[PDB]
Each structure stands twice: as C-alpha cells, then as structure tokens.
Amino acid sequence: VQLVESGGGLVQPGGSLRLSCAASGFSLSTGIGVTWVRQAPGKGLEWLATIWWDDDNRYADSVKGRFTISADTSKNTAYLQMNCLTAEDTAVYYCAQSAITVTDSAMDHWGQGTLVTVSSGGSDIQMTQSPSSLSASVGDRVTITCRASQDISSYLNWYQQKPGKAPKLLIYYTSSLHSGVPSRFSGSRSGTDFTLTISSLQPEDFATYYCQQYSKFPWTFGQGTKVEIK
Amino acid sequence: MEVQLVESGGGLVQPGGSLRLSCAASGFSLSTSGIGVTWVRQAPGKGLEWLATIWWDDDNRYADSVKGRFTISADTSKNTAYLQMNCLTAEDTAVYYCAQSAITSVTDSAMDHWGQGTLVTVSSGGGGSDIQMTQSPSSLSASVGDRVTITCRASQDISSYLNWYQQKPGKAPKLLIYYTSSLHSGVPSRFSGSRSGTDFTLTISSLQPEDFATYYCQQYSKFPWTFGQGTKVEI
C-alpha cells in the first residue's frame, strides 16, 4: 500500500488550492477510507476530514464550509479542495488509509505529506511599542515609545482605549492634538522613533495606548501600552 | 446631535459561516461611496488589527488576514457601511469596530468616531462534546535502554478505541498500536499499549537509538477524531 500527496505550494490568503492523494496497492471502492490530517510547523497532528467507500464523509469544525473531501474511484485518488485559506492553514498535509476491521479503525500507510504555505508580506510596516505596561501615580509624567520598522515620515497617530470602550483618537500626524485632548498630552518624532508623553497623569488616563502608522497600507498598530495609575 | 457610528450584526456563528456587520452614521453623513470608513478588530485580550478601508477611486484596501474572505461596501443613501464576512474561522473571534478616517489631506488619515463595537464569536460550541486527549509528559529525555512510559487521558469514555502513532523528525507518522494494545505488523516487540481507567499507556520497554521521536495518541470512539498533543522523546 502507498499513498502519494500532491498539490501543495504557496497560496495567497483567501485563495484556494486542491490537494490530491493518489493510492496504490488497494482500491478506494472497497471498509476503506481516506483521511486528511495536517501538522502546522512545530505543532501536533490535526484531523481534518475522512471520506469512506460508501460516500460517507466527516469534517473537523476547523475546516467545515471551507474544505471539501472527495474521491474519484476511477483514478483511485482522493482530493482535499481547500477554499478560503488562512494563515492558520499553513501546514504539511498528509493523507492516510483507514481500513475498517469495527474495533480496528486506524490511520495507516500515511503519505510523505505536502506543504501548503498560505502567504502573500515582508513589506508590511511593523510598529513596536515599549514599555508594554507601566504603573505610575497621579501627577507623574510618563513616556511611551514606538518604533516603525521603516521610515513612515510623520504619518503616525496615537489612540487611547479605556477598559470596555472603543479607542479614541488622541494625537494625529505625530504631534497634532485631537479636539478635546488637553495640552498635558504631546507627541513627538525622532526618525523612526515616536514618543507619546502624558504630563500630570490623572486617574482617567487608565487605559491602553496604541500607535498606528498610515504611511502605507496595510495600516498597522503597535501592540499597545497599558497604563495603570496607583 | 452627537456624531457617532453605530454597529450591529455581531453574534455567535459556526466556523465556515457568514455574517454581515453594519456601521451606521449618525450626526454626520458618509462621503461618496463611504470613503474613509474603516474596520478594525480586537481579539479578546489582544491589540488592534486594521482590516479594511474604503479608499479613493474605488480602491477597497484589505489586510492579508481577511482579503478574499471579507468584503467592505457602503450604501450612502442609508448612511451605512458594511463588512461582510465569509469563511469565518475561530481566529476571527473579536470585537469589530468601524471608524471614519479623515479624507481631505494625506497629512491626516486618522480614524475618528469609532463605534461601540460588535462582538463576533466564531465557535461551534462543540469543545464540550469533542473528546479531548491529554498526554503526559509533553516531552522527556531518557537514555538508551531506559523504560519509557507515556500516558494519554480521554476527557470522556472512549471504550478501548485508542491508537498510538510515532513520528520521527521530518517524516510521516507511523501507526504503532491500535485498539489500545494490538501491534501493527513490523512494530518492534518493545512497544506495548494498555489501559487503566481513562488512562492509556504506551510503554517502550527498552529505548533504542531509533526510538527518539514524537508519539501521539488518537481516539476513534467518535468523530471528530482527536489526537493528543504529542510526547517528544529525546536523548
């Protein structure tokens, strides 16, 4: 018995790809089933779908409505049609034979696998903030920094998000204060480094602060800095 | 009148399913074609992720994470914009916000008037009914000749419907033991399997140099077939 997977490669997110599993040494017509399983890089095994000789088929919730298992017995080959692909679908895809004996149901004669990489990327601008959290007291002055992975001119904004609330724009275009934002807040730039300074910290400043660049699409955000006041 | 964006359409949905969120403007009017309306999401406990913006000259911009799955549109006669979501995955669970970017100058595209957010939960709810297999330890180091015992617990009754697989670095898994204790042909006699209660054991009586690998259990009492997380056996 042998199973051979084909069809993997690079594919765009939201794209589609069809994998094939070609069987030698048995007939898919015959207690026989073919199953797909995947393994994301460095992770464990994830059962995806099984198709039986009687047209019986079963799917994992992670792929139902996106992937379709089928077989063409005239070609002794099973297929995994993978639509709506996501970054989480990057993995080696294996097929395996499941030969009922009812108590004796196992996945056997696994193929060598085929790698599917869901990716478009290295040009996205990464914004990194530091610190990721800080604590200070009423009246204090605190600074939050971000760094762009490439020059973004002055096309950087800062948002404040209080717990349970939507973000509010605080500073735009590096240093312009939004209406309603008092002048104890300020924003500055030195090259790829940007600083939000909060003077005279108040209890209402308890929030997570995010930078965001609009030099290029995709628009990207820093990971946030949580400010606690105690 | 307050200038606000109001969102609706969130809820619980099965993976693979579809939803449509709406973003209705109040106290101001959307500009032509909803230009500048933007969607951003926040997964539970995580940061902000830009998803999509209606931009100039019929250029709808999307993040790689949602392109080809989600679609942004707007009907300005209703002063409402939309994010339609197909092919939903667990990783799409998040609070979804809309906002209106400034549109007059490239000096300022900042997002303002963010909506309250609408929660989208992509879940089959089956975690409860799916059988989780838990292996212990997750990794161990031992010497050639050591006895090695790997355990696997099922979260519910699986009878004796448990298989064990071996996977060596860079290779396909191989079936070692099926139906708790039956050896596949060709499997060395030093491998054996047993059950005590909900605990299933794979024992290697004397570890050999070729036995360094990751071992997985797997139940077939019910679909979905589920695997333990693996136990890596190293030198």
Side-chain angles (χ1 to χ4, degrees), chain A residues 1 3-26 28-42 44-52 57-74 76-87 89-99 105-111 113-164 166-167 169-215 217-225 227 229, chain B residues 1 3 5-45 47-167 169-170 172-173 175-194 196-221 223-231 233-234:
Chain A
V1 173
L3 303 176
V4 188
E5 303 96 346
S6 56
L10 187 86
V11 53
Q12 288 286 341
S16 288
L17 200 61
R18 180 180 84 159
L19 307 184
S20 302
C21 173
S24 50
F26 64 106
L28 303 184
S29 45
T30 316
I32 290 299
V34 176
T35 293
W36 291 92
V37 173
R38 68 185 179 185
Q39 180 166 53
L45 298 172
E46 180 182 13
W47 172 78
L48 301 181
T50 293
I51 189 173
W52 293 109
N57 65 3
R58 301 280 186 274
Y59 292 91
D61 288 343
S62 55
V63 303
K64 77 169 172 190
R66 303 196 297 118
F67 297 5
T68 300
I69 194 170
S70 69
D72 181 349
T73 54
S74 59
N76 222 38
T77 296
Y79 301 99
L80 191 70
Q81 178 66 47
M82 299 187 308
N83 301 327
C84 279
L85 281 159
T86 73
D89 299 314
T90 292
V92 172
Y93 284 74
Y94 296 100
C95 63
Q97 184 213 27
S98 210
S105 172
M107 285 165 279
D108 202 2
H109 306 129
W110 299 56
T114 190
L115 175 69
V116 180
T117 307
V118 183
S119 156
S120 54
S123 49
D124 295 349
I125 299 165
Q126 312 287 147
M127 306 300 307
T128 57
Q129 294 183 220
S130 185
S132 56
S133 67
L134 68 90
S135 306
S137 297
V138 173
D140 285 348
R141 179 172 277 147
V142 294
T143 64
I144 298 166
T145 67
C146 66
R147 170 163 294 156
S149 60
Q150 71 189 59
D151 193 284
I152 60 167
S153 306
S154 294
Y155 303 129
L156 184 122
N157 303 316
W158 290 96
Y159 304 87
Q160 179 191 58
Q161 188 185 27
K162 297 177 188 191
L169 180 56
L170 204 69
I171 297 188
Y172 62 99
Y173 192 34
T174 297
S175 58
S176 293
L177 295 188
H178 184 75
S179 76
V181 178
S183 69
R184 65 186 183 83
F185 290 86
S186 62
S188 62
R189 167 188 173 202
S190 293
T192 53
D193 291 3
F194 295 80
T195 302
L196 173 68
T197 304
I198 308 175
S199 301
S200 299
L201 195 65
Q202 301 294 304
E204 59 262 29
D205 296 340
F206 170 52
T208 304
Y209 296 83
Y210 296 90
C211 64
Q212 176 249 321
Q213 70 78 29
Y214 57 105
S215 177
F217 291 100
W219 291 349
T220 52
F221 289 93
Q223 80 273 17
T225 299
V227 174
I229 299 94
Chain B
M1 183 173 211
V3 171
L5 289 168
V6 178
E7 300 180 51
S8 54
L12 176 60
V13 64
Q14 290 274 346
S18 301
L19 285 178
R20 187 181 79 179
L21 313 183
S22 62
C23 173
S26 182
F28 77 111
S29 297
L30 299 183
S31 291
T32 300
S33 304
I35 179 82
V37 175
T38 299
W39 292 89
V40 175
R41 69 182 176 189
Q42 182 165 51
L48 298 171
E49 183 187 5
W50 172 81
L51 303 179
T53 294
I54 300 176
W55 211 232
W56 290 110
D57 203 13
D58 299 299
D59 177 23
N60 288 339
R61 310 310 285 246
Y62 293 95
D64 286 340
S65 56
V66 303
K67 75 177 176 183
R69 302 192 298 121
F70 297 5
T71 303
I72 201 177
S73 64
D75 176 355
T76 60
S77 78
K78 297 174 190 36
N79 223 32
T80 302
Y82 305 90
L83 183 66
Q84 198 277 317
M85 301 157 70
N86 280 341
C87 287
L88 281 166
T89 68
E91 293 76 28
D92 295 315
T93 293
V95 172
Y96 284 73
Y97 294 104
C98 62
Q100 173 70 61
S101 282
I103 67 169
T104 59
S105 176
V106 298
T107 64
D108 178 14
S109 306
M111 293 166 275
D112 200 3
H113 301 294
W114 293 59
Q116 87 277 8
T118 192
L119 178 63
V120 171
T121 299
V122 184
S123 177
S124 64
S129 67
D130 291 353
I131 302 170
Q132 280 78 38
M133 301 306 304
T134 300
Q135 310 189 202
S136 183
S138 64
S139 63
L140 66 97
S141 301
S143 295
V144 170
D146 284 0
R147 181 186 179 81
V148 171
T149 299
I150 297 173
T151 304
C152 171
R153 185 177 75 240
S155 69
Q156 312 161 21
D157 184 24
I158 64 168
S159 298
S160 303
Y161 302 134
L162 191 279
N163 302 320
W164 289 100
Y165 301 87
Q166 181 191 58
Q167 187 188 29
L175 177 59
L176 300 179
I177 294 175
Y178 67 92
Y179 191 52
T180 294
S181 60
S182 293
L183 263 69
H184 190 277
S185 61
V187 173
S189 63
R190 63 179 176 277
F191 294 92
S192 63
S194 69
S196 174
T198 60
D199 288 340
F200 294 79
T201 308
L202 175 67
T203 302
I204 310 175
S205 62
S206 177
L207 192 65
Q208 299 302 300
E210 60 267 33
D211 294 342
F212 299 101
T214 301
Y215 295 85
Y216 295 91
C217 65
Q218 176 246 326
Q219 71 79 29
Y220 60 99
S221 179
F223 288 93
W225 285 356
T226 50
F227 290 92
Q229 78 278 13
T231 300
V233 174
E234 325 178 78

